[PDB]
Design a protein around this ligand. Structure first.
Ligand SMILES: [Mg+2]
Ligand SMILES: [Mg+2]
Ligand SMILES: [Mg+2]
Ligand SMILES: [Mg+2]
Lengths: 291, 290, 290, 291
């Protein structure tokens, strides 16, 4: 079950009572699979995973995996503050059929390289499925060097993949060189989708497939076809929307976008606010011109 | 009761992995005996974020009971969701907290409107003062002085501001733009001296766990307006403050307490206990202070 | 027309430390034989800022004469004052320069209004195109895309934009906001591949002094739309591009030419010549690419 | 003669015809001395040193030293791109009686620690007067660690003083601790004037004395008197002006300020522009408030 191409981040719809709206989540999942995504990645920032209580988190994982029905690989974000809880969530995700889990070293205080390494070792040694190492300083507060990342990949059996969202293309260049092309890496930063693929990215994790699965998939196809000129055209066409998502927030824009697409998924959980009227109209236009 | 001077951050001892409340009680007594003007539980020092909800609730209750209002207690109630932050603020208040501290935590940027409303929600839910805490290094959110002042003036219960950016200019602005009416507090150890001279009303630190005497003397020297003694006292303790910063609060404080006759275990993974080499260096720093 | 591989020239010095024009001539011949599409003299690579006014004037003259218009020449006339920048731009034009490049160098921040008039003054003072060059790392000034676009659209002679921030997003924005009308060039070696794919019309580099073949091949592959071949070619030469940036342009390029049978001396102090270790590593890198 | 207290940066007035206005420069120097500065520092950023031709630079040095008539020490900024020219300027300054020189490692291209050390070594060994090592990454593009600075100071005889303009008070803490209080350091960052003195700075180099020498001097005196309360008050009273100078630029605000103070000194050299009407209005208000 190769993990590649367009990997769709799922959102977490909330019901009026503020609780989970699973039915809506199932529809969004079906919308993604039919949109032609190559995998599903639940409980990331897009899904406001960190806003969920433990019961809610468990329920979302369960429902998502049951819904997907192994039609495409599922990579669950199991990142948490403590090693114990990260391990526990990784084991839980595996027990329900997750093909892989993603681990970002989130922390409020700085972690040293030894502490980061052991964190990944503990998670990998506790499970039987692959772990995707996720480097995102902007959100986690930690910035792992390519050297450290490569040591974790080599020394930790289950750590096999690397996602980069630093926005710094040089990180992927170093991964390619120092990894000698044997360490598969993935793109996590939307505005760099084109460059990421050109640099050799095996896949692109994004919430955009929630709104424009077709354009996203065409970009990946163009790269596979080695069509440099077409890929550029496709990228610049969808870039504005990509910039807007980063600009106004993932869950904020995605949930609003799905709402405009006739799919009621409610609003984000406070303190995150729903897209305002002005932003909603602008998004409306962006989507109409892309369609 | 005025919140001022030396405000001691408590650590959270762990036993078997669970809480070691008896050890916590002992550490709290030390701090109060040590002359702290207030207690601040469940901050970064106390690894608050590593605690389960049940553990957090337990620590809050136990801490408040132990202190027994001998000094003011300001509880860190910050959490990701507004709903949870509000709940923790009300919980702390109901259990006797004199004040609460709120830091806008988020694994993704929040806009000024989202931040402002976050504080408004918390302030309106309680009847005790809120200390607004700006620490982008640990929170990922950096609030401008202008925004901070808007929150202080518009939200009744938000009355105090803690700065931990390490950027003294933030305090200068708070001083000028707030026209000296907005009390601010220092949360950055290596800036203790400058913060006080800039007008800081208090200093929130975990250092009192190890050197409560030098900490208190620095504050007193400032109160006495004795610039030269203050400078001397600060530089004498600076090396230790620098070390705490480089090697981590919970890591260094828990290690240091072990050297001071108080076993409090190790930090919670992925944070690791101070290594042998670091521990030896710490022993040297404390000796030299002596 | 400026496109493809624009080769930055170095400025050879004799043992004494003075100009070595013969060697410069040989290096220019190596570049043109190498297949460069343009020559860019007196940039950072050429240690332009290190030259006296007389030395600078002579290098420009000798360069333009040696080239004999076989390929376009774009002279870097950037200087601190507007008056001297204008003078240098006119001197270059009077000697046949096809165009000039202007970077807003300053030892103190300049405001957007000051930057704009600087370019306006230069543009209105000459009759050849001006390439606006944004390089914060080497200038101390970072021009916004909107500012750059405002200068290009309002200043007749300002027609081209060079980006050296290493931030691909700047080029994306130049593409969208410029609507594909504003031709931009890459000035950052390790971004050659991405820059071309993003829409870069040319790549100004000192690398052509060492590996003009691999350089041109990368450009040609992009012209053909061969994404895979381009990637392979880029990564093959990247190690060298990384080394140059890490050890210094003039330092590595002068050491490289030495190992390429073209003695060009060392950099002008305080810049030091490549050391033994770095020299052996560069030697290994080159032998592998050839 | 000790270099301490308030060291006044001079501006370089230009005549209507673009050339040097020596009479105006003389008047500004007298104003500084009468204002109670403890030293004069010509040809820094305040004086637009880098904007001057060689003949102009030489003349300003000559005229300045003659005007001062050794009433107070003069520390000339001799920093230049090449080691050769920096040495020449240092020697020229000394030949005309300069008490000391200041050296900042200017470089468009980055420089390594070895290159920086040798630069100072060359300058120090070429002259017979003290050198003030000046760290200002914001201007030079180079950021010398305190460790490197202390090595230079210890190993190069004539390098005896350190000026810090990073705005990072911790650098001064390190200089005091690692230097064991035997390496005199100076403040070059206006809005850090109070903290620098509190940290133990021996002197403060500023262009502010051109406008408010009295308040500048009073702050220093309060620090000497150990009066924490008064020092704080004096600093905050003048901070708005210090903030403004930094925000609007040295030559710009200083030359505009002197004009508002009855001393016509022309405008800065392009690309630097004169203070705008709105700025002049604000500045006039600040000065009237302080006087
Ligand atoms: Mg592995
Ligand atoms: Mg209030
Ligand atoms: Mg134009
Ligand atoms: Mg010395």
């Amino acid at each position: 079950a190769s993990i590649h191409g367009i990997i769709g981040y799922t959102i977490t719809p909330f019901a009026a009572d503020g609780g989970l709206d699973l039915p809506a989540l199932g529809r969004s999942i079906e919308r993604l699979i039919d949109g032609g995504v190559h995998a599903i990645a639940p409980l990331g920032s897009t899904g406001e995973g960190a806003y969920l209580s433990d019961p809610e988190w468990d329920e979302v994982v369960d429902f998502t995996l049951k819904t997907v029905a192994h039609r495409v690989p599922t990579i669950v974000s199991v990142s948490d503050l403590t090693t114990a809880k990260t391990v526990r969530r990784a084991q839980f995700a595996e027990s329900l059929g997750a093909e892989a889990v993603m681990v970002l070293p989130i922390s409020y205080w700085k972690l040293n390289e030894a502490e980061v390494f052991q964190h990944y070792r503990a998670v990998g040694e506790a499970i039987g499925v692959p772990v995707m190492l996720y480097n995102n300083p902007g959100t986690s507060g930690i910035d792992m060097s390519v050297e450290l990342i490569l040591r974790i990949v080599r020394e930790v059996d289950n750590v096999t993949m690397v996602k980069e969202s630093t926005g710094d293309i040089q990180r992927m260049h170093k991964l390619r060189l120092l990894g000698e092309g044997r360490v598969p890496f993935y793109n996590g930063c939307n505005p760099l989708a084109l460059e990421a693929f050109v640099a050799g990215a095996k896949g692109w994790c994004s919430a955009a497939p929630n709104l424009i699965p077709t354009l996203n998939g065409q970009l990946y196809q163009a790269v596979l076809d080695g069509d440099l000129e077409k890929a550029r055209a496709l990228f610049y066409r969808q870039l504005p929307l990509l910039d807007f998502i980063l600009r106004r927030g993932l869950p904020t824009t995605i949930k609003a976008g799905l709402g405009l697409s006739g799919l009621e998924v409610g609003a984000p959980r406070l303190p995150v606010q729903a897209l305002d009227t002005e932003g909603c109209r602008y998004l409306q236009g962006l989507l109409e011109e892309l369609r």
